[PDB]
Design a protein around this ligand. Structure first.
Ligand SMILES: C[N+](C)(C)CCOP(=O)(O)O
Lengths: 222, 220
């Protein structure tokens, strides 16, 4: 029941600021070293800030890469770990993770967050536009193939796609985003399932969850 | 700073195999007082947060299969996977939990080798809903092939090909260690509406004959 859930992240203009937060539950927050880790697009984990247990003054430490612009705090009453991000630049774009630096015999990170994406960009948000991916009953071989073309959106950040169908035969394929022409992304998500699990005038809804924004869903006909 | 050097940076095993990744530090990680090294091994599966793998240099975290084992002390550590399996597909990071700033290594991508598999191809015509916007996107999906190297040609109508095509490889499947790819050719409603026989043909080591899913229509 040791859970860490971070939030607040997305599009931010260079010079902008953000306040990422880490909601820590199922343990005595007030006495575990908390840690902030980031992961740039095609790079290693990178350690940034560090908070300390109410054992030796909630002292901090910051990576050189961030010493000065980021500032780490903790709302002890509410068990939340904060990260104040000042004067962001594009190099700051990465998935942010909050971790618990446990110490028993040794030190190691026992529990990690899910992460939260932060895109520091000059560009501007554009929600995907969901188009159904269907075959006129002259191309469907059974199993049926269906999908969702998630198109022309910004930023890329994080896109979780789920369908209103699951079980034995039912496959989901989510292709990574592709930078098109406009410098905007496109992605596709196909669902394959038993032809009898996708008769007619039925449909399956696909759900798009992008960064920190509300859900977007389309109804796709078998 | 303390540097974490991990090698190889890539590993391609056939599975059922036994492997060993290494990880040396520029500085002793071992306590000179409690005598334990402060080095952890993390496993990072495709689009998932890291997960505790090994603590101390050899303590396997509760839940981790007995296939994962770790040795060393001082500055040169190892990690061996006794019998590589299809879900082992991930990145292995070793970290210095010795002193600040904490550091990680480049990691090691573990890739699974398998017997060549043939791609299933699909062609989806542009949506009505989308047409009525200027655009037209003909998407072709290629699923479950091996190896990944697979060229796809988009001969619009007569014969063509172009810079109006997007391509995306899926990650290696954690069940079949097979790939999937989508190729999206997106033109204009007008543009689209000129020709009418749209084709997709992949050229995979598998078969000799370029595999060609196709479709003709546009008038309608
Ligand atoms: C916890 N730690 C291993 C990252 C550092 C230990 O010493 P300190 O954190 O008190 O400086």
């Amino acid at each position: 029941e040791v859970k860490l859930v971070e939030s607040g992240g997305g599009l931010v203009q260079p010079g902008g600021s953000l306040r990422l937060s880490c909601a820590t539950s199922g343990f005595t927050f007030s006495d575990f070293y908390m840690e902030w880790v980031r992961q740039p697009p095609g790079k290693r984990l990178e350690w940034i800030a560090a908070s300390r247990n109410k054992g030796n003054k909630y002292t901090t430490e910051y990576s050189a890469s961030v010493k000065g612009r980021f500032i780490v705090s903790r709302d002890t009453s509410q068990s939340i770990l904060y990260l104040q991000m000042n004067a962001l630049r594009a190099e700051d774009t990465a998935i942010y993770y909050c971790a618990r630096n446990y110490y028993g015999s040794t030190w190691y990170f026992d529990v990690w967050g899910a992460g939260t994406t932060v895109t520091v960009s000059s560009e501007s948000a554009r929600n995907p536009t969901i188009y159904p991916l269907t075959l006129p009953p002259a191309l469907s071989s059974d199993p049926v193939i269906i999908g969702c073309l998630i198109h022309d959106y910004f930023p890329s950040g994080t896109m979780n796609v789920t369908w209103g169908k699951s079980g034995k035969d039912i496959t989901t394929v989510n292709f990574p985003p592709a930078l098109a022409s406009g410098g905007r992304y496109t992605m596709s998500n196909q669902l394959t399932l038993p032809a009898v699990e996708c008769p007619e005038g039925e449909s399956v809804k696909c759900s798009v969850q992008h960064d920190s924004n509300p859900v977007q869903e389309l109804d796709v006909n078998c | 700073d303390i540097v974490m050097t991990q090698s190889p940076s890539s590993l391609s095993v056939s599975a059922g195999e036994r492997v060993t990744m290494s990880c040396k530090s520029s500085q002793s990680l071992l306590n000179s007082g409690n005598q334990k090294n402060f080095l952890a091994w993390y496993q990072q599966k495709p689009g998932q947060p890291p997960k505790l793998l090994i603590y101390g240099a050899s303590t396997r975290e509760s839940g981790v299969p007995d296939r994962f084992t770790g040795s060393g002390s001082g500055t040169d550590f190892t990690l061996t996977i006794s019998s590589v399996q299809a879900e082992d597909l991930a990145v292995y990071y070793c970290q210095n939990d010795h002193s600040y700033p904490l550091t990680f290594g480049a990691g090691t991508k573990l890739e699974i080798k398998r017997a060549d598999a043939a791609p299933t191809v699909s062609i989806f015509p542009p949506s009505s809903e989308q047409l009525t916007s200027g655009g037209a996107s003909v998407v072709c999906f290629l699923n479950n092939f091996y190896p990944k190297d697979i060229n796809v040609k988009w001969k619009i109508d007569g014969s063509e090909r172009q810079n109006g095509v997007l391509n995306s490889w899926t990650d290696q499947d954690s069940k079949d260690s097979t790939y999937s790819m989508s190729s999206t050719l997106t033109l204009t409603k007008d543009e689209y509406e000129r020709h009418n026989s749209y084709t997709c043909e992949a050229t995979h080591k598998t078969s000799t004959s370029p595999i060609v899913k196709s479709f003709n229509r546009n008038e309608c």
